[PDB]
């Protein structure tokens, strides 16, 4: 038993990380087959950041303006194209450590593992959620760009995130691996803010189910509520509305514990209304929303 | 910016996870060069969990009673020895994926990543601390045993933890990689309980320095303390005594912030009195004690 913020094992993705140099700019690339994916802002100088002309700055580049460094082995760029906000560099060498993979775009509320990298070298692995405001609360310093978000399904790596920037609130913004931004953000050093976030309610109900599965039961009450009446208490506390989608999705945890979603919703209502009376749930003083229903079933089943 | 409970990249340890079967018992082994390290309780039946005689159980065992599986490949056990509470199986094949490694025994307050494993397969990676009471707050199910804890310095994996048992408070006990238990615990299903846990004070201090590095000062005050006055107050919150050794270790974080350790001690003392008054520090409403001074310098300074 026990319940941790658990990351996916990172080995398949560590075998894919390279250093991409364009001029003085170094960041990370994902090397899959004979293509290296990286943020297009690698080609930007200091200047070329308030108003980058990407189409224009790209055409002024040769293949040999890009040094791609695969540990200590230098990869020769034999092609270059931009897809939205990712640069795709065709390399003379295919990655022998390429996993079973697809590119996937996630929803707000869905979780992933980040492999934080610097100069092509994996640094740390952590679990994140896509905030409803389409930011992630990562841990990213200078030269973290080209760090990727992933899920594993069996032996298949699902790449869902590439890291691009930090917003003034210390939160992070990026794209899928096709270079489409999550959220209303642009890859220019200009004034950008995170929108006001809300709490991923389905994830909190799923986290209370995890608490119950670990014999942490104190928050359980007698009230049954309606879906509407819980979504009215919820919207006052900046919680996401909970939809039948979200209720049917808690099925396996309601079955596992025998506790009906609406009985659990009546608990979280009471918790929203009061607080935790100097008690914790699974050793947190806050209502956690960065564990999906699949995360709780996954962890608890092994 | 940002601050995450962050684990080492798991690939170098994922390269080492095997399945060890005995009769009906399957658990995890650590495959390094031509030896598999696993829990000696793999040789236990249903009966023998209470007062196992390990020397008498093992003498009855041949090399060929030990089924070691690396992915598909079954390894050939050509030797067995007992070292404390670990079983060592000499196999006919050196692991080609053996990373640079050492075995280290850690102290309470030290942090490590766990690769959670079932049947030699990886579940997940998470960050843990050796609690003052020689337990860890893990996430471990049936057949979790042999799952290991580790740190990585550059390219070297230092193995520090092997999983053996869950105590009745839902916390975890294990050995070093020489099979010496952390704490007073034994590999028997005898009545055992962890002693009352204390907060790792040097870690909470290190984490407050991390919050200041990240731009947060709200919790500081114009007061200082003596080390002794600090220890009289903190010992009333079930905080570990802070030593001069702990003061010395916080020295780099002090230099970086320009806040003397005893001034930050004064800060913690007031936080213990007042709590957070609806505020959070690095997204927590509790005082976080599972980041070392070293972990903070690692994530906030690189
Ligand atoms: C990645 N390699 C870096 C810095 C990382 C990202 C997360 N934390 C970091 O410190 N990314 C960048 O330098 C990007 C890059 C230009 C500016 N930029 C930013 O992250 C800046 N932020 C913004 O301009 C904002 F707020 F709008 F997002 C910066 C002020 C340097 C943090 C480009 C092309 C967006
Ligand atoms: C919890 C249980 C009551 C079963 C027991 N605990 C106590 O006997 C104690 F309370 F005394 F410690 C206990 O863990 N074990 C009994 C037996 C080994 C260990 C065990 O079964 N290990 C499992 C590995 N195959 C993983 C476990 C179960 C879920 N989470 C874990 O970590 C040994 C100590 C020899």
Numbering used by the authors:
A (entry chain B), B (entry chain A): 1 to 302
What does the paper say about this structure?
The SARS-CoV-2 Main protease (Mpro) or 3C-like protease (3CLpro) is a dimeric cysteine protease responsible for the cleavage of the viral polyproteins 1a and 1ab in 11 sites, including its own N and C terminal. Mpro substrate recognition has unique features and is specific for Gln residue at P1, hydrophobic residues at P2, and small side chains such as Ser and Ala at P1’. The absence of similar sites in human proteases together with the importance of the enzyme for the viral replication makes Mpro a primary target for antiviral discovery and development. Herein, we evaluated the effect of single mutations in the active site of Mpro from circulating polymorphisms on the kinetics and inhibitory constants of nirmatrelvir and ensitrelvir.
All crystal structures were obtained in the orthorhombic space group with one dimer of Mpro in the asymmetric unit, following the pattern of the seeding samples used, whereas the G143S mutant was solved in the monoclinic space group with a similar crystal packing but with two dimers in the asymmetric unit. C145 and G143 residues are responsible for stabilizing the oxyanion hole, where the backbone nitrogen interacts through hydrogen bonds. For the mutant G143S complex, we observed that the pyrrolidone group from nirmatrelvir that occupies the S1 pocket appears in four distinct orientations, one to each chain in the two dimmers composing the asymmetric unit. The mutant G143S complex revealed that the substitution of a glycine residue with a serine changed the charge distribution around S1 subpocket, causing multiple conformations of the pyrrolidone moiety. As a crystallographic consequence, the multiple conformations of the pyrrolidone caused the break of one of the orthorhombic 2-fold symmetry axis, shifting this crystal to a monoclinic space group with cells like the above. The mutation of G143 to serine shifted the charge distribution and/or stereochemistry on S1, preventing the stabilization of the pyrrolidinone group into a single conformation. A similar effect might explain why this mutation also depleted the enzyme efficacy versus a substrate containing Gln side chain at P1. The only exception was the G143S mutant, where nirmatrelvir Ki value was 0.96 ± 0.23 μM. Mutants N142S, R188S, A191V, A193S, and A193T showed similar relative catalytic efficiencies to the WT. Mutants G143S, Q189K, and A193V showed diminished relative catalytic efficiencies in comparison with the WT, with a reduction of 33-, 3-, and 2-fold, respectively.
